[PDB]
Structure formats: C-alpha cells, structure tokens
Amino acid sequence: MIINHNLAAINSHRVLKFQNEEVSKNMEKLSSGMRINRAGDDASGLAVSEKMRTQVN
C-alpha cells in the first residue's frame, strides 16, 4: 500500500477539525447564554435584537 501519504488520516483530521470548530462555537454559545454572540450567526436577528433593546431601555 501507499505509505508516503495516509489518506484516511487526512480525512479524519479534516472532519475532526471541523467538529472542533463546531464544538467551540457551541461552547461559546453556552458560556454567553446568548444565541447571537458574534455577527453572522443571524444578521437580521442581531439588528432586530439591538433595535428592541434600544426600545426596551
């Protein structure tokens, strides 16, 4: 078999890295207690939330 490149290892590492990104996003979501932490999660939702926060204050 080909030993110069472990092709299964590369794919598993790719999947693991994206899983780690997802779990980090979920961990930050848990820690903040807020669904929309950064921009891009829901732009319209974030804008509406900011407007309603101003209205509430």
Partner: protein, 56 residues
C-alpha cells in the same frame, strides 16, 4: 375627558413594534399602505394574513 382622550390618540399613534406602527390601521382590512403576513411554513406560499383595524 380631553386630557385622557389625548393619550388615547397617543397610544394610537405611538403603539409600535420593530419600526412598525400597528394601531394606525396600516394592516387593516381595506388598508392599501401595507399588508402583514406570517410565513408559518417551510416551503413556498405557506403564509398567512393578520388584520389589525384602525384604533385612532
């Protein structure tokens, strides 16, 4: 009566939502200005209409 009819008009012209005035009648039955819809489904024209009459 005048003093507490004035604030009735105040609620009518100021009852608001996310940059939408509600009780002015913009979402009435015969209103032409705009129409209010709720997309309550996951595909195509799965919408619904909600009517709010004038309250001035």
């Amino acid at each position: 009566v005048s003093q507490l009819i004035d604030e009735v008009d105040r609620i009518a012209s100021q009852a608001e939502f996310n940059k939408m005035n509600l009780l002015q009648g913009d979402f009435a039955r015969g209103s032409r200005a705009t129409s209010m819809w709720f997309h309550i489904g996951p595909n195509m024209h799965q919408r619904e209409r909600v009517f709010i009459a004038t309250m001035t």
